[PDB]
Amino acid sequence: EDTPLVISKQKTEVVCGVPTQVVCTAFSSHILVVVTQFGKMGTLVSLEPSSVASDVSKPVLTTKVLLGQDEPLIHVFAKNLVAFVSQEAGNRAVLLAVAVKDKSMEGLKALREVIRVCQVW
Amino acid sequence: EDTPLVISKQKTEVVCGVPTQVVCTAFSSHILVVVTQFGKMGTLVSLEPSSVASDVSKPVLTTKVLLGQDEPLIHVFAKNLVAFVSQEAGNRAVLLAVAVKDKSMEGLKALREVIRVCQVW
Ligand SMILES: [K+]
Ligand SMILES: [K+]
């Protein structure tokens, strides 16, 4: 027997032909989101609500690549993949591990649907 | 129903009076180890096998604090907590999320025992 201290949910789903496992875990000040294809951990991105820029209505979601190649697309993709998680979880920081080599709008929408199935906030 | 793509195991155990959840997940090039108390994600540390120093028998396990306060004890503690994971998993990198405020040798040994219960390598 076991009783978790934090809520986690996972789901394996095919996304644009690729089996993909999603895991979401709710910590008090972070949601950890894992999106893994082909057994790989991929790129680790922190998404931190930060000081407003021109729009004072909502925090800026600042991205940092912590592990893996720091290249510009993954920052933008990560924001579109999990900004909704941060927002819905009370403007909480998100730690994302993302291993998705072949990206598209169709795939992005499908990944967000799996993350929604794994909602823990 | 569901079928994971990566092996994960978790356990909640009391360690020196504190309920602690451990999760280990095996990716092809990383073991992700979560050690959480009080619902917190804590400090994120990467432990990367790296170029030898004076002892040529084994890689150096280089630590980097990726999220949380970068202070010297957590580097050393992290190495003693999960070096065995890296070694046993084929000198694999480890990504550690560790939220343990009150550290001791007794507690360190007990945490390693929980990580062993959650072996995924
Ligand atoms: K990948
Ligand atoms: K902590």
Author numbering:
A (entry chain A), B (entry chain A): 2 to 122
Provide text from the study.
There is considerable evidence that the assembly of the eukaryotic 26S proteasome does not proceed spontaneously, but is mediated by several assembly chaperones. The formation of the 20S CP is assisted by five proteasome-specific chaperones: PAC1–PAC4 and POMP in humans; Pba1–Pba4 and Ump1 in yeast. Recently reported knock-out experiments indicated that α4, α5, α6, and α7 form a core assembly intermediate as part of the initial process of α-ring assembly, which is supported by PAC3-PAC4. In summary, we produced structural insights into the functional mechanisms of the PAC3-PAC4 heterodimer as a molecular matchmaker underpinning the α4-α5-α6 subcomplex during α-ring formation.
In addition, we newly determined a 0.96-Å high-resolution trigonal structure of the PAC3 homodimer. The overall structure of the trigonal form was very similar to that of the tetragonal structure we have previously published, except for a loop comprised of residues 51–61, suggesting that it is mobile. Loop flexibility was also observed in the corresponding segment of the yeast ortholog Pba3 in its heterodimer with Pba4. Our nuclear magnetic resonance (NMR) relaxation data from the human PAC3 homodimer confirmed that the loop is indeed mobile and disordered in solution. A complex model, model A, based on the 2.00-Å PAC3 structure showed that the mobile loop was turned toward the solvent. Another model based on the 0.96-Å structure, model B, showed that the corresponding loop contacts α6. Apart from interactions involving this mobile loop, intermolecular contacts between the PAC3-PAC4 heterodimer and the proteasomal subunits are almost identical in the two models. Specifically, Ser55, Lys80, and Asn81 of PAC3 form hydrogen bonds or electrostatic interactions with Ser110, Asp94, and Arg96 of α6, respectively. There are also predicted hydrophobic interactions of Val61, Phe85, and Val77 in PAC3 with Phe87, Phe97, and Leu93 in α6. Therefore, despite the low sequence similarity, the overall interaction modes of the matchmaking chaperones with the proteasomal subunits appear to be conserved between humans and yeast. It is plausible that the conformational flexibility of the mobile 51–61 loop of PAC3, which carries the α6-contacting residues, contributes to the interaction adjustability.
